[PDB]
A paper describes a structure:
A key source of retroelement repression is the family of Krüppel-associated box zinc-finger proteins (KRAB-ZFPs) and KRAB-associated protein 1 (KAP1, also known as TRIM28 or TIF1β). KAP1 is an 835-amino acid, 89-kDa protein from the tripartite motif (TRIM) family.
The overall structure of the KAP1 RBCC dimer resembles a dumbbell. The ends of the coiled coil are capped by a B-box 2 domain. Unexpectedly, there was no interpretable electron density for B-box 1 (residues 139–203), indicating that its position relative to the other domains is variable and does not obey the crystallographic symmetry. However, in contrast to the TRIM32 RING, which dimerizes in solution via α-helices flanking the core RING domain, the KAP1 RING domains in the RBCC dimer are located on opposite ends of the coiled-coil domain and do not form any homotypic contacts. Intriguingly, examination of our KAP1 RBCC crystal structure revealed a cluster of solvent-exposed hydrophobic residues near the twofold axis (V293, M297, L300).
Residue numbers in the entry:
A (entry chain B): -111 to 95, 108 to 138, 204 to 406
B (entry chain A): -111 to 95, 111 to 140, 204 to 405
Amino acid sequence: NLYFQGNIFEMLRIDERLRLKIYKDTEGYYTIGIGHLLTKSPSLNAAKSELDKAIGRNCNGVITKDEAEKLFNQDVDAAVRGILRNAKLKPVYDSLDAVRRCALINMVFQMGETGVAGFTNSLRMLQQKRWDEAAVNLAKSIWYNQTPNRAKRVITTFRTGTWDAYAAEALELLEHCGVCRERLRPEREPRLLPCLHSACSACLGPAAAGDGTVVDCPVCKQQCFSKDIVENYFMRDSERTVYCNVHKHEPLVLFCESCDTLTCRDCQLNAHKDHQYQFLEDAVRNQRKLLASLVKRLGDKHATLQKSTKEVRSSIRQVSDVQKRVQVDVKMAILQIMKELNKRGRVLVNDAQKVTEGQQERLERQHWTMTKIQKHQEHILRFASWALESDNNTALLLSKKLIYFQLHRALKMIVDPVEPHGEMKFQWDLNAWTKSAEAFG
Amino acid sequence: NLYFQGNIFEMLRIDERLRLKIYKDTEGYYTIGIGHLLTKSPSLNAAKSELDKAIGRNCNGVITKDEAEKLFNQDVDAAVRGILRNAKLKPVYDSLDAVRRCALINMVFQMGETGVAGFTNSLRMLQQKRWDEAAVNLAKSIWYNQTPNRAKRVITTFRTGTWDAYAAEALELLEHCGVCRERLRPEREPRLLPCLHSACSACLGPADGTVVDCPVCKQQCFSKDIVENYFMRDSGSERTVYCNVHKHEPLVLFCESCDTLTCRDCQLNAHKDHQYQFLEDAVRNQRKLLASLVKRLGDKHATLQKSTKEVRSSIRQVSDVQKRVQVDVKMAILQIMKELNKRGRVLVNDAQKVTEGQQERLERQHWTMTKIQKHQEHILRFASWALESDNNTALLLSKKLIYFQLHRALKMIVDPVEPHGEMKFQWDLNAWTKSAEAF
Ligand SMILES: [Zn+2]
Ligand SMILES: [Zn+2]
Ligand SMILES: [Zn+2]
Ligand SMILES: [Zn+2]
Ligand SMILES: [Zn+2]
Ligand SMILES: [Zn+2]
Ligand SMILES: [Zn+2]
Ligand SMILES: [Zn+2]
């Protein structure tokens, strides 16, 4: 079976149905819009208060489509925020591919992060690539018993790693109207608009020069004419042959090429009296051939389209990588320039260190000899000032004089300072503007 | 009026003696060297074990001069370590002058950091610059009754902030030999070498003569140039030394010929016809001359110590110059790298601009492509639904008119990739010749 599907915003659109009026689930909580949980209390006024909290105006329990989809985007983004914020389901969230992360966001949006935080052992089996055990363990839960359809679909999407389980449903819902999503079996008269959507006779809205003749499709809001809509002749059984319009109880069996209208016997002899004709078998086979050719071509063009689409996604990834490339290579190049400059500076300080260690060594030696001179001079001075004691110290003149005569000094070569670096900062303020940003060309 | 000291940490050399043999402390402990406390136990063999552990060689309980002074420097550096390590006496250490700091180091050397950390009440008085209170409170400490001499000297140096209290001792010790620190009385016979140091007759080296090395400054002199210290007969007793060759008649005459105090027998022989000089007249004259010489030397010494201080200032200035050079180089390098980082940020900003523009274009194009893909999937799902054999032919018009809608993948230019394009060759060359270092 041939399946066609989108990605992840769609899936929340397929699982839940859009209702702009406040509604109670047959067994659940008061919700509104597209699966927006207002409150869990039974009181309607509480639900309306939470409604006005979400909208900001008094609505009286009725919303509009744009506001419902704004709340939808808010709810989905908040669910993913509550996923990445929670510390117990994030490590298992990171290791999954887009599709399973996708399914998990759906599960959290339906039951809440705390609701899915209870399913410990199924998550422990899912993180480690043990799929089937997780599926069967997930089947036994209240979430499965309340809404078994959605639960089975989400479990299947976890199992397969593809959106096919919803693609199949997209095809199934193709037999249901796009408004109230009821089965278009002919009780309510089905209608098929030129946009190839199907609806009920009551789900068309309202439905004097001009009263109608113009109608907006309820799902895609593409304008078409009231005459171009035909009853969905496809929902007829599960007889095949339809009876003629003007000719009651008289089946159609000829195809008029003049009027291009499938016709009845009496019609193509009276009305289409001189028109062309084809026996139904040959014309039906012909048109089936043509439409099969068109669908093959459309499938080919769509395949090439999505291939080019993913190539463009790859191209945006690559432009972001190019941006990182340029920025980090510039940072590292300038860092290398500053590194070679710091190396030059560290080698330069060594020269000041050498000259200063030399001069300081000479002056330190000079200071040492000067301290020795000072000390032994003080000694001579005390011993000579010891002439105060009245005595016949004449017998000690020779030692006291000739040693008092000890006068000496030293000397070192006076040197100049080297404190200026003498950098030409003008050259560097000019050289700062030497920035090249080439291109691939 | 004789303050001459002008030193820094010889004060420990003046307070504590030098002993190459083990000696018993004033406290009764086993000590050696220059006030190095080995242990407080009475047993000597423990003292010899700690000594050989500290010295490193087999000593047999006796050390030499240079290694003892090695231990002196070692102990002083360890005392300063124990000062800067302790958190009770470091804040009080910083607020002191160099001299008062030397005094604190002396106290730590004598009693230990834990010993001086106990005088908390008095220590806090030092950092508040209340000197007299600190002096009086320290004067009544256990340390004062134990070793009152060193305590009085250190307390005077703390009170005054000068080395005067040690200059006095420096002059007092002038009457003691520089070796065994005994009082130079008539016994223990003093001798005065030409280097103007004084020693005992026994402290001039043990068993080649007529040449002898001074025991304290190790200056070579002759065993004949040494004269007995004629200056120290204050004790007891009239007191004139007798002639050299004539062992019985004293020298009372002064010859102007030889400038030598002479005896009368020597006047009969040698200075037979010389000019002589009266007693007082010669002594007063030579006293005048030597006073003039000491004036000259004192002035020269004052200017000398001034030059010494100034030279220390110059060696500080060269270190300040070194710090200046290194920090100015660092700051210049940082400043250029700052403006370089700024230019880099502006270039990255331009790259961000171009890339975000291209990204917006490709994102909206991808959105329209997703729209097309979904609309095509819808048409295809409804058309591939022709499998049910039926009168779908009564629906031809709708299936074809919408099936024929094929449209508009709407392209854009692939933008060239942006590389770097720097010139590190030329720029590392210009980086390698930035330095001047002019004088
Ligand atoms: Zn409906
Ligand atoms: Zn439509
Ligand atoms: Zn008819
Ligand atoms: Zn016709
Ligand atoms: Zn002696
Ligand atoms: Zn000497
Ligand atoms: Zn004479
Ligand atoms: Zn004589």
